[PDB]
């Protein structure tokens, strides 16, 4: 139970969230690609998302 | 080649080959442990290493 | 005037989740031995020995 201004504010905050799902592919492509292409370094995914 | 496996630090091809349960062959120096028990023969323990 | 049939509203949101910002604790990068490092042309970084 709220006034239309407050409800509009809260609903706009709810529907315009800044957060996005985090996949293994997303976290893998967030790492810079040049370092990934290297062979001196090895990037292994160990922690479970 | 185990020499290359240690030298470059990569584990991509071997891991994917072993996970899908496909034939593999490794060439290189390895110390051996001798087990002379038929119990170990019947109860498969030569592949759990 | 306070009207109840329009002041009432329903909110929409996700059930529950956790906030992740670091995005680097889920990746491990172990360097190769310093002696055997190579370059873009697959030749060793230091070719003098």
Q: Please give the resolution of this entry in Å, rounded to 1 decimal.
A: 4.7
Structure token digits, residue B10: 């990569």
How far apart CA B20 and CA C40 sit, in angstroms, is: 32
Dihedral, CA of residue A44, residue A47, residue A48 and residue B4, to nearest 10: 20
Cross-chain Cβ contact A44/C20 below 8 Å: no
Q: Which residue do the tokens 């491990």 mark? A: C28
Mutation target among B4, B9, B13 for the A interface, most CBs of A within 10 A: B9
**Alpha-carbon separation of residue C32 from A9, B4, B7, C17, C45 (angstroms):** 53, 12, 7, 37, 12
Inter-residue contact B9 to C28 (CB < 8 Å): no
C-alpha distances in Å from residue A48, one per residue of A22, A26, A28, C40: 11, 14, 13, 32
Residue pair B14/A42 in contact (Cβ under 8 Å)? The answer is: no
C28 touching chain B per CB within 8 A: no
A contact chains, 3+ CB pairs < 8 A:
B, C
Pairwise CB contact (< 8 Å): A39 & B11: no
d(CA C38, CA C48) in angstroms, rounded, equals 13
Which helix H or strand E contains C30, and what residues bound it? strand C27-31
Residue with token string 């529950």: C16
């Amino acid at each position: 139970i709220l006034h239309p201004i407050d409800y509009a504010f809260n609903e706009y905050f709810l529907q315009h969230q800044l957060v996005e799902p985090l996949n293994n592919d997303i976290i893998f492509n967030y790492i810079p690609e040049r370092i990934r292409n290297d062979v001196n370094y090895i990037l292994n995914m160990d922690r479970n998302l | 080649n185990l020499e290359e496996l240690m030298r470059t630090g990569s584990y991509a091809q071997i891991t994917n080959m072993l996970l899908n349960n496909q034939p593999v062959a490794l060439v290189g120096a390895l110390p051996f442990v001798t087990d002379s028990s038929v119990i170990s023969l019947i109860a498969i323990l030569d592949a759990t290493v | 005037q306070f009207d109840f049939r329009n002041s009432m509203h329903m909110l929409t949101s996700n059930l529950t989740f956790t906030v992740y910002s670091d995005l680097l604790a889920f990746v491990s990068a172990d360097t190769v031995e310093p002696i055997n490092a190579v370059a873009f042309d697959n030749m060793r970084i230091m070719n003098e020995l």
